[PDB]
Amino acid sequence: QGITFSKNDVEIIARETLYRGFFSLDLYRFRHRLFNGGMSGEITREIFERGHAAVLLPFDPVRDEVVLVEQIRIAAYDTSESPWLLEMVAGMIEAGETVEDVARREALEEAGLEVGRTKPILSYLASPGGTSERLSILVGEVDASTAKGIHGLAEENEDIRVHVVSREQAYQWVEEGKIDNAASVIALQWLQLHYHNLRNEWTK
Amino acid sequence: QGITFSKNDVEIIARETLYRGFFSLDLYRFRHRLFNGGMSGEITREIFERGHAAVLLPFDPVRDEVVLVEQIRIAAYDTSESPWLLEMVAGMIEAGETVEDVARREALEEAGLEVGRTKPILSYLASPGGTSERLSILVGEVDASTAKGIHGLAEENEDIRVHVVSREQAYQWVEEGKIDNAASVIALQWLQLHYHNLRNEWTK
Numbered sequence: 001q002g003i004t005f006s007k008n009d010v011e012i013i014a015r016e017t018l019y020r021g022f023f024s025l026d027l028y029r030f031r032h033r034l035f036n037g038g039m040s041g042e043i044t045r046e047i048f049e050r051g052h053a054a055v056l057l058p059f060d061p062v063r064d065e066v067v068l069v070e071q072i073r074i075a076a077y078d079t080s081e082s083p084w085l086l087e088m089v090a091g092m093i094e095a096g097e098t099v100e101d102v103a104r105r106e107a108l109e110e111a112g113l114e115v116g117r118t119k120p121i122l123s124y125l126a127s128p129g130g131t132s133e134r135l136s137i138l139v140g141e142v143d144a145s146t147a148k149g150i151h152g153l154a155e156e157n158e159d160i161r162v163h164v165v166s167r168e169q170a171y172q173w174v175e176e177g178k179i180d181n182a183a184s185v186i187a188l189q190w191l192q193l194h195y196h197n198l199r200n201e202w203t204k
Numbered sequence: 205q206g207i208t209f210s211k212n213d214v215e216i217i218a219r220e221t222l223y224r225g226f227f228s229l230d231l232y233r234f235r236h237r238l239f240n241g242g243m244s245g246e247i248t249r250e251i252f253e254r255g256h257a258a259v260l261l262p263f264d265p266v267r268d269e270v271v272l273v274e275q276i277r278i279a280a281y282d283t284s285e286s287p288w289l290l291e292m293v294a295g296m297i298e299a300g301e302t303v304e305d306v307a308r309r310e311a312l313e314e315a316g317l318e319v320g321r322t323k324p325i326l327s328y329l330a331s332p333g334g335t336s337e338r339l340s341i342l343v344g345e346v347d348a349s350t351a352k353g354i355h356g357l358a359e360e361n362e363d364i365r366v367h368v369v370s371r372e373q374a375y376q377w378v379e380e381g382k383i384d385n386a387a388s389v390i391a392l393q394w395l396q397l398h399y400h401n402l403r404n405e406w407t408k
């Protein structure tokens with residue numbers, strides 16, 4: 001059971017920089033084993049290289065509340081009613097940093113929030129047919145009464161509004177499509193599947 | 205409650221295609237309303253443009269089983285033990301096509317599956333800070349006893365193996381990180397939250 005082939009079964013021959021800017025687009029050139037027993041020819045794939053992220057679900061287990069951050073994501077424009085999205089605290093992981101350190105820093109910068117205990121949720125590939133991006137989600141214990149106002153680093157063009165909702169309200173917003181970005185959907189579905197045990201663990 | 209601003213509150217000054225090949229990388233140039241009042245200055249963001257996708261979770265409600273497809277995703281290489289992933293049926297939406305048309309076609313091409321009823325799951329933005337990609341997920345009724353073998357269009361370097369597992373096993377693999385691509389995580393978490401009602405609906 002499970003997958004069939006490993007890194008022993010693929011060779012990346014080269015990678016070519018197609019675009020170098022704030023992010024990169026690379027052409028991976030590779031060969032790989034086929035399920036029918038043979039080897040492929042040379043395959044090329046364009047891969048968006050934009051580093052990797054830490055994501056924090058800020059959950060108040062006493063009040064059963066979730067903290068959301070609202071900010072514009074221009075890429076949402078063409079397929080969404082508004083480019084302002086309700087999301088999780090999140091940011092890029094730089095060389096040598098831990099997921100948890102990034103999550104704590106972004107929680108302060110983006111929501112004014114201190115974080116207590118944490119637990120991993122899931123680490124996922126956003127869209128692995130075309131981007132290498134992995135996002136590692138934690139749940140962090142917060143006092144949602146301290147979450148309010150306008151945050152973000154303005155000198156970085158980051159303008160963020162904090163919203164506090166109940167867990168059930170946040171999940172309803174997922175069901176209705178009002179929250180519809182992968183990181184938040186995954187985190188809030190996870191919360192719906194684990195909140196009983198998590199609240200118990202964090203209110204003992 | 206909900207979001208604060210709409211499309212009237214952002215001005216997209218220009219878009220510039222920085223790279224065009226199989227996919228594109230566009231630079232969006234825009235200004236937008238700020239929460240504390242006023243307008244931002246001009247901001248630029250590099251956005252990976254690769255169109256949008258239809259995704260099908262193939263669920264057998266008689267057997268409580270799911271059909272997974274396995275194929276290499278080279279972008280997973282640098283952060284995963286293997287680039288071969290277990291995933292949902294999925295394909296790009298071409299001009300004029302519906303999500304449902306694409307989902308049904310890909311289920312046949314990628315898994316040899318005829319699909320009975322479908323229902324929407326969720327439509328999500330994969331990673332809206334850096335890509336416009338939206339993926340719309342349906343759950344599709346299948347007979348998992350008909351799912352086996354090697355599929356995908358080999359003339360297009362799409363080499364796919366079918367796997368059948370229990371829903372519970374597929375969800376356990378999400379919890380364990382053996383399934384860790386967004387489309388499958390979102391679909392299988394949704395299934396874990398809705399399967400009881402879905403099985404009742406589809407075995408009437």
Ligand SMILES: Cc1cc2nc3c(=O)[nH]c(=O)nc-3n(C[C@H](O)[C@H](O)[C@H](O)COP(=O)(O)O)c2cc1C
Pocket residue numbers: 043044045046047129226227360
């Ligand atoms: C069905 C199909 C799917 C493809 N999918 C991708 C893809 O996901 N990413 C990518 O970079 N190129 C993709 N390509 C493009 C191929 O890698 C290649 O650039 C194209 O087929 C032209 O090959 P040629 O220059 O040898 O004629 C796809 C091509 C086909 C026909």
Ligand SMILES: Cc1cc2nc3c(=O)[nH]c(=O)nc-3n(C[C@H](O)[C@H](O)[C@H](O)COP(=O)(O)O)c2cc1C
Pocket residue numbers: 022023156247248249250251333
């Ligand atoms: C903190 C920070 C975050 C940034 N995030 C992004 C980003 O997500 N996407 C992007 O295309 N550029 C991003 N940029 C790059 C800026 O959009 C801009 O290109 C860069 O600051 C250079 O601007 P300049 O030409 O005025 O010097 C970021 C820059 C900074 C300082």
Ligand SMILES: [Mg+2]
Pocket residue numbers: 007008
């Ligand atoms: Mg080797």
Ligand SMILES: [Mg+2]
Pocket residue numbers: 089090091106110
């Ligand atoms: Mg952020």
Ligand SMILES: [Mg+2]
Pocket residue numbers: 090091106109110158
């Ligand atoms: Mg930030």
Ligand SMILES: [Mg+2]
Pocket residue numbers: 273291292293294295314
């Ligand atoms: Mg597929």
Ligand SMILES: [Mg+2]
Pocket residue numbers: 294295310313314362
């Ligand atoms: Mg296909």
